[PDB]
Amino acid sequence: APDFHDKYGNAVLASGATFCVAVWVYMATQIGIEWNPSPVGRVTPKEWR
């Protein structure tokens, strides 16, 4: 006789994975967090003096 995991395993895995990826991607890119990546290959140096 099928247990909790046999009945809900696939759903808990699928919707767990989807939720976690979605909300981490959202938090990482949409709310103004400054990650301060390397300037290397991304910043054009500008005159400062």
């Binding site: 809900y8 395993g9 909300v23 981490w24």
Partner: protein, 144 residues
Amino acid sequence: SVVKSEDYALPSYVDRRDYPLPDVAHVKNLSASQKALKEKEKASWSSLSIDEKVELYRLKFKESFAEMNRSTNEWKTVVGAAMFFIGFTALLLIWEKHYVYGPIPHTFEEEWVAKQTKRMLDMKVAPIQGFSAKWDYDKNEWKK
């Protein structure tokens, strides 16, 4: 069959790969037909039917090796659920960014950064490997 708390000091039954013949039978009380079966077991086992043999097995043991060693779908629940709570953590971080944190220093504005980066290059910050090493001073650009 039915195990009680106040039997802890008695020899008990276990299903374990590495303890194949436990200290007691799975089933200790026997019905009339079960008694007759234990009697028949004293004669040639060739005269036992398949059903009778299964029944003798099931009197002695609870689960077979195959049953006891079976794998399950628990991992899905576990991994799924962990991802869910890690996901939930992101909501706490979102709440914190919105309601707790103020603006970050002005030194992270894009123009500040671009100026700081030049200055770091003019000062040859990490010129051997770390930073300036990656800048082509001849072609005035990041090393491809």
